[PDB]
Amino acid sequence: PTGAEFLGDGGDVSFSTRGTQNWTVERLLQAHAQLEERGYVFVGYHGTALEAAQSIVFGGVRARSQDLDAIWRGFYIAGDPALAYGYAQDQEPDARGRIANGALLRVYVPHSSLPGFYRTSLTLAAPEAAGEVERLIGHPLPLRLDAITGPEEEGGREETILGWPLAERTVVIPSAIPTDPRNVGGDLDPSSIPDKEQAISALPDYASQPGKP
Ligand SMILES: CN(C)CC(=O)Nc1ccc2[nH]c(=O)c3ccccc3c2c1
Numbered sequence: 001p002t003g004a005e006f007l008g009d010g011g012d013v014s015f016s017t018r019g020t021q022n023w024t025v026e027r028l029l030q031a032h033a034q035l036e037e038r039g040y041v042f043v044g045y046h047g048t049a050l051e052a053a054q055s056i057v058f059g060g061v062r063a064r065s066q067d068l069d070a071i072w073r074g075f076y077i078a079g080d081p082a083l084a085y086g087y088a089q090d091q092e093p094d095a096r097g098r099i100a101n102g103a104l105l106r107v108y109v110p111h112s113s114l115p116g117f118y119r120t121s122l123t124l125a126a127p128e129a130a131g132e133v134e135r136l137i138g139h140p141l142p143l144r145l146d147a148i149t150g151p152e153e154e155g156g157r158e159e160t161i162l163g164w165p166l167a168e169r170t171v172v173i174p175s176a177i178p179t180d181p182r183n184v185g186g187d188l189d190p191s192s193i194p195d196k197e198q199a200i201s202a203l204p205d206y207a208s209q210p211g212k213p
Pocket residue numbers: 045046047048076077078083084085087088089091159160
Protein backbone atom coordinates (compact mmCIF):
# COMPACT_ATOMS: atom_id res chain seq x y z
CA PRO A 1 0.00 0.00 0.00
CA THR A 2 1.98 3.09 -1.34
CA GLY A 3 0.92 6.50 -2.42
CA ALA A 4 1.02 5.39 -5.99
CA GLU A 5 -2.23 3.50 -5.30
CA PHE A 6 -3.98 6.71 -4.17
CA LEU A 7 -3.18 9.20 -6.95
CA GLY A 8 -6.64 9.06 -8.47
CA ASP A 9 -7.53 9.61 -12.05
CA GLY A 10 -5.38 11.53 -14.46
CA GLY A 11 -2.07 11.07 -16.10
CA ASP A 12 1.15 9.76 -14.74
CA VAL A 13 2.55 11.92 -11.93
CA SER A 14 6.18 12.90 -11.82
CA PHE A 15 8.28 15.24 -9.76
CA SER A 16 10.17 18.08 -11.50
CA THR A 17 11.77 21.40 -10.57
CA ARG A 18 9.00 23.09 -12.36
CA GLY A 19 6.36 21.38 -10.38
CA THR A 20 4.67 18.08 -9.97
CA GLN A 21 3.44 17.01 -13.36
CA ASN A 22 -0.14 15.99 -13.78
CA TRP A 23 -0.96 17.06 -10.20
CA THR A 24 -3.40 19.72 -9.34
CA VAL A 25 -5.38 20.69 -6.26
CA GLU A 26 -8.47 19.30 -7.93
CA ARG A 27 -6.75 15.92 -8.34
CA LEU A 28 -5.56 16.09 -4.77
CA LEU A 29 -9.11 16.46 -3.60
CA GLN A 30 -10.02 13.17 -5.28
CA ALA A 31 -6.95 11.43 -3.94
CA HIS A 32 -7.64 12.75 -0.42
CA ALA A 33 -11.14 11.43 -0.51
CA GLN A 34 -9.87 8.01 -1.63
CA LEU A 35 -7.37 7.90 1.23
CA GLU A 36 -10.08 8.89 3.82
CA GLU A 37 -12.32 6.18 2.43
CA ARG A 38 -9.69 3.59 3.00
CA GLY A 39 -9.12 4.66 6.64
CA TYR A 40 -6.13 6.97 6.31
CA VAL A 41 -5.76 10.29 8.07
CA PHE A 42 -3.53 13.29 7.17
CA VAL A 43 -0.76 13.96 9.69
CA GLY A 44 1.45 16.47 8.02
CA TYR A 45 3.82 17.57 5.25
CA HIS A 46 7.13 16.14 4.32
CA GLY A 47 9.61 18.21 2.23
CA THR A 48 12.32 16.39 0.32
CA ALA A 49 14.31 16.18 -2.85
CA LEU A 50 12.76 15.13 -6.13
CA GLU A 51 14.23 11.69 -6.40
CA ALA A 52 13.41 10.98 -2.72
CA ALA A 53 9.85 12.16 -3.36
CA GLN A 54 9.51 9.78 -6.18
CA SER A 55 10.89 6.89 -4.09
CA ILE A 56 8.52 7.70 -1.19
CA VAL A 57 5.39 8.03 -3.31
CA PHE A 58 6.01 5.08 -5.69
CA GLY A 59 8.13 2.80 -3.58
CA GLY A 60 6.85 3.60 -0.09
CA VAL A 61 8.26 5.15 3.02
CA ARG A 62 11.27 3.07 4.19
CA ALA A 63 13.95 3.72 6.65
CA ARG A 64 17.29 4.03 4.96
CA SER A 65 19.56 3.23 7.98
CA GLN A 66 20.68 6.85 8.27
CA ASP A 67 21.83 8.37 11.55
CA LEU A 68 21.45 5.00 13.30
CA ASP A 69 21.70 5.26 17.07
CA ALA A 70 20.55 8.97 17.07
CA ILE A 71 17.74 8.98 19.59
CA TRP A 72 15.61 11.36 17.47
CA ARG A 73 15.76 9.31 14.28
CA GLY A 74 12.59 8.83 12.36
CA PHE A 75 10.48 10.30 9.58
CA TYR A 76 10.15 14.05 10.04
CA ILE A 77 6.95 15.79 9.05
CA ALA A 78 5.17 19.03 9.97
CA GLY A 79 1.62 20.12 10.26
CA ASP A 80 2.68 23.53 8.97
CA PRO A 81 3.90 23.27 5.33
CA ALA A 82 6.17 26.14 5.93
CA LEU A 83 8.34 24.10 8.19
CA ALA A 84 8.50 21.27 5.71
CA TYR A 85 9.16 23.68 2.79
CA GLY A 86 12.65 24.38 4.05
CA TYR A 87 13.70 20.77 3.52
CA ALA A 88 12.19 20.52 0.07
CA GLN A 89 15.40 20.63 -1.98
CA ASP A 90 18.35 18.62 -3.15
CA GLN A 91 20.89 18.25 -0.26
CA GLU A 92 24.08 18.26 -2.35
CA PRO A 93 24.68 20.73 -5.28
CA ASP A 94 25.00 19.81 -8.98
CA ALA A 95 28.14 19.54 -11.02
CA ARG A 96 27.69 23.33 -11.68
CA GLY A 97 26.72 24.57 -8.20
CA ARG A 98 22.95 24.31 -8.81
CA ILE A 99 20.81 23.01 -5.85
CA ALA A 100 17.36 22.11 -7.27
CA ASN A 101 14.12 22.73 -5.45
CA GLY A 102 12.33 19.64 -4.21
CA ALA A 103 8.76 18.74 -3.44
CA LEU A 104 6.22 18.92 -0.69
CA LEU A 105 4.42 15.68 0.14
CA ARG A 106 1.32 14.92 2.25
CA VAL A 107 1.69 12.06 4.74
CA TYR A 108 -1.29 9.84 5.75
CA VAL A 109 -1.41 7.14 8.43
CA PRO A 110 -4.00 4.51 9.24
CA HIS A 111 -6.54 5.91 11.58
CA SER A 112 -5.98 3.16 14.13
CA SER A 113 -2.38 4.34 14.59
CA LEU A 114 -3.50 7.73 16.04
CA PRO A 115 -3.32 6.57 19.67
CA GLY A 116 0.53 6.35 19.21
CA PHE A 117 0.85 10.04 18.40
CA TYR A 118 1.89 12.18 21.31
CA ARG A 119 2.58 15.88 21.87
CA THR A 120 5.01 17.51 24.24
CA SER A 121 5.03 20.92 25.66
CA LEU A 122 8.80 20.87 25.78
CA THR A 123 11.06 21.86 23.08
CA LEU A 124 12.72 18.79 21.52
CA ALA A 125 16.19 20.30 21.87
CA ALA A 126 15.75 20.81 25.68
CA PRO A 127 18.03 18.38 27.60
CA GLU A 128 14.89 17.23 29.60
CA ALA A 129 12.91 16.33 26.42
CA ALA A 130 14.27 12.88 25.74
CA GLY A 131 13.28 11.73 29.15
CA GLU A 132 9.89 13.37 29.01
CA VAL A 133 9.17 11.81 25.65
CA GLU A 134 10.27 8.36 26.84
CA ARG A 135 7.69 8.73 29.59
CA LEU A 136 4.97 9.53 27.05
CA ILE A 137 5.75 6.74 24.66
CA GLY A 138 6.59 4.16 27.47
CA HIS A 139 9.93 3.05 26.24
CA PRO A 140 13.36 4.30 25.52
CA LEU A 141 14.05 6.33 22.37
CA PRO A 142 14.19 5.95 19.47
CA LEU A 143 10.56 6.10 18.56
CA ARG A 144 9.09 2.81 17.31
CA LEU A 145 5.31 2.45 16.58
CA ASP A 146 4.78 5.89 17.85
CA ALA A 147 5.32 9.61 17.12
CA ILE A 148 6.13 12.80 18.93
CA THR A 149 5.18 16.35 18.05
CA GLY A 150 6.81 19.40 19.60
CA PRO A 151 8.74 22.54 18.89
CA GLU A 152 12.04 22.23 17.33
CA GLU A 153 13.39 25.03 19.63
CA GLU A 154 11.57 27.71 21.79
CA GLY A 155 8.98 29.63 19.70
CA GLY A 156 9.60 27.24 16.90
CA ARG A 157 6.98 25.62 14.76
CA GLU A 158 6.17 22.03 15.79
CA GLU A 159 7.75 19.10 14.09
CA THR A 160 6.33 15.62 14.17
CA ILE A 161 8.69 12.68 14.20
CA LEU A 162 7.27 9.28 13.26
CA GLY A 163 9.22 6.33 14.49
CA TRP A 164 10.50 4.37 11.49
CA PRO A 165 8.21 1.38 12.10
CA LEU A 166 5.20 3.71 12.18
CA ALA A 167 6.49 5.63 9.20
CA GLU A 168 6.48 2.37 7.20
CA ARG A 169 2.72 2.24 7.68
CA THR A 170 2.21 5.70 6.05
CA VAL A 171 1.10 6.42 2.50
CA VAL A 172 2.41 9.62 0.93
CA ILE A 173 1.01 11.62 -2.04
CA PRO A 174 2.08 15.00 -3.51
CA SER A 175 0.94 18.29 -2.10
CA ALA A 176 -0.45 20.88 -4.51
CA ILE A 177 1.77 23.52 -2.78
CA PRO A 178 4.59 24.31 -5.21
CA THR A 179 8.24 24.84 -4.39
CA ASP A 180 10.04 27.71 -6.21
CA PRO A 181 13.33 27.13 -8.12
CA ARG A 182 14.31 30.71 -7.21
CA ASN A 183 13.58 30.36 -3.49
CA VAL A 184 15.83 27.46 -2.54
CA GLY A 185 16.93 27.98 1.11
CA GLY A 186 13.97 30.27 1.54
CA ASP A 187 10.58 30.60 3.10
CA LEU A 188 7.25 29.38 1.82
CA ASP A 189 4.99 32.02 0.39
CA PRO A 190 1.70 31.67 2.29
CA SER A 191 -0.25 32.78 -0.77
CA SER A 192 1.01 29.89 -2.84
CA ILE A 193 -0.92 27.47 -0.55
CA PRO A 194 -4.15 26.55 -2.30
CA ASP A 195 -7.20 27.27 -0.26
CA LYS A 196 -8.77 24.03 -1.23
CA GLU A 197 -5.69 22.17 0.14
CA GLN A 198 -5.88 24.08 3.36
CA ALA A 199 -9.43 22.90 3.71
CA ILE A 200 -8.34 19.28 3.79
CA SER A 201 -5.28 19.82 6.00
CA ALA A 202 -6.60 19.85 9.53
CA LEU A 203 -4.58 17.64 11.82
CA PRO A 204 -5.95 15.16 14.39
CA ASP A 205 -6.63 16.21 17.93
CA TYR A 206 -3.20 15.14 19.36
CA ALA A 207 -1.77 18.15 17.50
CA SER A 208 -3.89 20.78 19.26
CA GLN A 209 -4.56 19.26 22.66
CA PRO A 210 -2.20 20.59 25.30
CA GLY A 211 1.25 19.05 25.13
CA LYS A 212 2.36 16.89 27.99
CA PRO A 213 5.07 18.11 30.24
C1 LIG B 1 18.65 18.80 5.26
N1 LIG B 1 17.58 17.78 5.04
C2 LIG B 1 17.02 17.87 3.67
C3 LIG B 1 18.01 16.39 5.46
C4 LIG B 1 17.83 16.11 6.97
O1 LIG B 1 18.89 16.27 7.58
N2 LIG B 1 16.69 15.80 7.70
C5 LIG B 1 15.41 15.97 7.31
C6 LIG B 1 15.02 15.66 5.99
C7 LIG B 1 13.76 15.98 5.48
C8 LIG B 1 12.81 16.63 6.30
N3 LIG B 1 11.64 17.00 5.74
C9 LIG B 1 10.69 17.51 6.51
O2 LIG B 1 9.63 17.87 6.04
C10 LIG B 1 10.95 18.00 7.88
C11 LIG B 1 9.89 18.67 8.58
C12 LIG B 1 10.08 19.03 9.89
C13 LIG B 1 11.32 18.80 10.50
C14 LIG B 1 12.38 18.19 9.82
C15 LIG B 1 12.20 17.77 8.49
C16 LIG B 1 13.20 17.03 7.69
C17 LIG B 1 14.51 16.67 8.18
